[PDB]
């Protein structure tokens, strides 16, 4: 290919439903990243590692209780095959609600890895000793439970892929407006039609500060605001208080 | 169908990439919920609402700056068509990093709705006046940015679908173990082979409390622990301190 590839990422995926990953590899910005060789996603399915007639991928938990776990042998063999394909330096990630909570800073840390292997749990998850022996890091995409680790893995791939050069402040987005000039009686703020680029930049920043303060004030606590940001935030708070 | 349907959910989706949703509708537990008529996902693509030769779905932002926005007319017409199909009572949700942060409690609130319409933003998102006029609630799946609202929408569908009867404490999961009895020298905790159901329940609960304290102690602050939980947590903390 001709598209500059230097920072490309390889992501191995272990999943019982590899076809789910077409949602990222066949469409959109991520699909383009795959076609241009900026991103490669390679999947291994534990089902292909079973030897019994029925291709059994689940197993009963010690101690009983409801639920099944992923069967150790097919999952372990799939992980080992993915690790051999990756060569040296691949970090193996398991997605689960018990993992470190993902945020944009963590996305940018993960995007530093040229190789990742993402293990997608189903059922009640994977045997704890496999976490100990095969998993480098455990991450959660949020505090909620899904039917498998595939959507979390897809979410992580998409988030990290945005930080790969060529694929494409700590505050919420400012409001954005497009045509038409009047929509259900609502008008575009005149500043955005002014052509004054500095006034527009400051208005957008002030709106982002105001929205972050009103919706997610804890996000402001994590920032050391610039002098300009402190002033625009004070102005917004004064206006909000009238 | 014969599968009991009483609590079924209908989810309309507005997306430029409706085929991404096959990942949920064709596979796994969610795929089964669709086949059994517990969950219906119906998609409308703004591209089908364009009238120009090139089927234009993006538009330039007022005030310039980088990025495009979703074009208002095709998106608005798609939303209106979805609302007409839904009939009365559909809550219209826009997924974005500026929305209320999703957690399991919020999932269970959302699962009370028999009808949802999920609007998937691409580019720099949707015109603010469309949020004002067409959107009931804005939600985020986590503090990170993706290339579109499709994966967030899929994540929300899967999370809510688990609370639909028939599809399938505030603490992290306890460790789980399956065969074999010894794995890379690591043994299953003897209690889980004891056959003593009460001792197993208490061990699992104590482990969940210990893991939550060590990994996500802020989660314990949100709970009013039961008497039994307070005792097992104190025991775990004492053991951790030796
Ligand atoms: N006890 C349920 C749990 C057992 C272990 C496997 C998971 C798979 N599903 C997931 C995975 C990850 C996330 C997340 N928040 O990152 C949510 N859901 C389900
Ligand atoms: N400025 C970027 C932003 C513009 C507006 C549309 C979104 C689409 N992508 C999303 C959507 C939702 C989430 C989430 N955390 O729920 C993340 N990513 C992108």
* DSSP codes of every residue in chain A: --S--TT-EEEEEE-S-GGGGHHHHSSHHHHHHHHTTSEEEEEE-GGGG--STT---EEPPTT--S--EE-HHHHHHHHHHHHHHH-TTPEEEEEEEEEEEP-HHHHHHHTT-SEEEEEE--TT---HHHHHHH-SEEEESSSS--S-SHHHHHHHHHHHHTTSTT----SPPPP---S-SEETTEE--GGGGS--HHHHHHHHHHHHHHHHHHH-HHHHHT----HHHHHHHHHHHHHHT-
Q: Say if residue A157 is in the same domain as residue A201.
A: no
Residue among B147, B161, B216 whose CB faces A29 most closely? B147
Structure tokens given for A36: 């241009």
Cis peptide, bond prior to residue B180, ω within 30 of zero: yes
Q: Say if residue A158 is in the same domain as residue A229.
A: no
Distance from CA of A238 to the nearest CA of B (A): 22
Q: Strand, coil or helix: what is B100? A: strand
Q: Say if residue A69 is in the same domain as residue A183.
A: no
Q: List the domain range (segments joined by +) for residue A4.
A: 1-168
User: What gap in Å lies between CA B94 and CA B77, rounded to an integer?
Assistant: 16
- B142 appears as a binding residue in the annotation: yes
- Asked if A189 and A200 count as a contact pair (C-beta separation under 8 A), the reply is no
Q: Say if residue B163 is in the same domain as residue B94.
A: yes
Last residue in a domain, options A143, A168, A193: A168
Q: Is the dihedral of CA B26, A128, B204, B171 positive or negative?
A: negative
Residue B65 zone, left/alpha/beta (φ > 0; ψ -120 to 50; rest) = left
Last residue in a domain, options A168, A183, A216: A168
**In the beta sheet, which residues pair with residue B9?**
B39
Does the beta-carbon distance from B178 to A103 stay under 8 Å?
A: no
Q: Say if residue A43 is in the same domain as residue A77.
A: yes
Q: What are phi and psi of A128, to 5 degrees?
A: -55, -35
Which of A142, A208, A212 should be substituted to probe chain B, the one whose Cβ sees the most B Cβ atoms within 10 Å?
Answer: A142
- Asked if B155 and A151 count as a contact pair (C-beta separation under 8 A), the reply is yes
> Which ligand is closest in space to the CA of residue A139?
1
Which of B176, B182, B194 should be substituted to probe chain A, the one whose Cβ sees the most A Cβ atoms within 10 Å?
Answer: B176
* DSSP codes of every residue in B179-221: S-SEETTEE--GGGGS--HHHHHHHHHHHHHHHHHHH-HHHHH
Q: Say if residue A41 is in the same domain as residue A144.
A: yes
The domain tally of chain B equals 2
Does the beta-carbon distance from A200 to B107 stay under 8 Å?
A: no
CA of A186 to the centre of ligand 1 (A): 43
- Asked if A46 and A18 count as a contact pair (C-beta separation under 8 A), the reply is no
* Block residue for tokens 């096959």: B22
Strand order in the sheet with A9-14: A39-44, A9-14, A115-120, A91-101, A137-140
* DSSP codes of every residue in A136-190: SEEEESSSS--S-SHHHHHHHHHHHHTTSTT----SPPPP---S-SEETTEE--G
CA of B185 to the centre of ligand 1 (A): 27
- Asked if B225 and B212 count as a contact pair (C-beta separation under 8 A), the reply is no
Residues of B in contact with A20 (CB under 8 A): 23, 27-28
CATH number for the domain that contains residue B219:
1.10.1270.20
- Asked if A14 and A49 count as a contact pair (C-beta separation under 8 A), the reply is no
Q: Say if residue B148 is in the same domain as residue B187.
A: no
Residues of A in contact with B173 (CB under 8 A): 96-98, 124-125
Q: Is the dihedral of CA B230, B236, B240, B242 positive or negative?
A: positive
Q: Say if residue A28 is in the same domain as residue A54.
A: yes
- Asked if B76 and A180 count as a contact pair (C-beta separation under 8 A), the reply is no
**What's the reported resolution, in angstroms, to a tenth?**
1.7
Residue B131: closest CA among B90, B72, B81:
B72
Q: Burial-class residue A41 by CB neighbours within 10 Å (0-12, 13-18, 19+).
A: buried
- E strand or H helix at B139, and its extent? strand B137-140
User: What gap in Å lies between CA B7 and CA A229, rounded to an integer?
Assistant: 48
- E strand or H helix at B138, and its extent? strand B137-140
Q: Say if residue B150 is in the same domain as residue B177.
A: no
Q: Say if residue A161 is in the same domain as residue A182.
A: no
CATH number for the domain that contains residue B34:
3.40.1280.10
User: What gap in Å lies between CA A168 and CA A163, rounded to an integer?
Assistant: 8
Last residue in a domain, options B110, B136, B168: B168
User: What gap in Å lies between CA B36 and CA A41, rounded to an integer?
Assistant: 32
Q: Say if residue B156 is in the same domain as residue B188.
A: no
**Which residue of chain A has the CA closest to B132?**
A186
């Amino acid at each position: 290919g001709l598209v500059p590839r230097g920072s490309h990422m390889w992501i191995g995926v272990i999943s019982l439903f590899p076809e789910m990953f077409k949602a990222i590899t066949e469409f959109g910005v991520t699909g383009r990243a795959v076609k241009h060789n900026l991103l490669k996603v390679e999947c291994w399915n534990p089902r292909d590692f079973t030897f019994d007639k029925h291709k059994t991928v689940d197993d009963r938990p010690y101690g009983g209780g409801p639920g099944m776990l992923m069967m150790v042998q097919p999952l372990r063999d799939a992980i080992h095959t993915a690790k051999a394909a990756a060569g040296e330096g691949a970090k193996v990630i398991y997605l689960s609600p018990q993992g470190r909570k993902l945020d944009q800073g963590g996305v940018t840390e993960l995007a530093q890895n040229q190789k990742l292997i993402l293990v997608c749990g189903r059922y009640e998850g994977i045997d704890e000793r496999l976490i100990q022996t095969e998993i480098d890091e455990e991450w959660s995409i949020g505090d909620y439970v899904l039917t498998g680790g595939e959507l979390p893995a897809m979410t992580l791939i998409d988030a990290v892929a945005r930080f790969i050069p060529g694929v494409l402040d700590g505050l919420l987005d400012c409001p954005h407006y497009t045509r038409p000039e009047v929509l259900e009686g609502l008008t575009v703020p005149p500043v955005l039609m002014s052509g004054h680029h500095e006034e527009i930049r400051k208005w957008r920043l002030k709106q982002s500060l105001q929205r972050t303060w009103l919706r997610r004030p804890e996000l402001l606590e994590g920032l050391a605001l610039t002098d300009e940001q402190r002033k625009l935030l004070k102005e917004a708070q004064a206006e909000h208080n009238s």
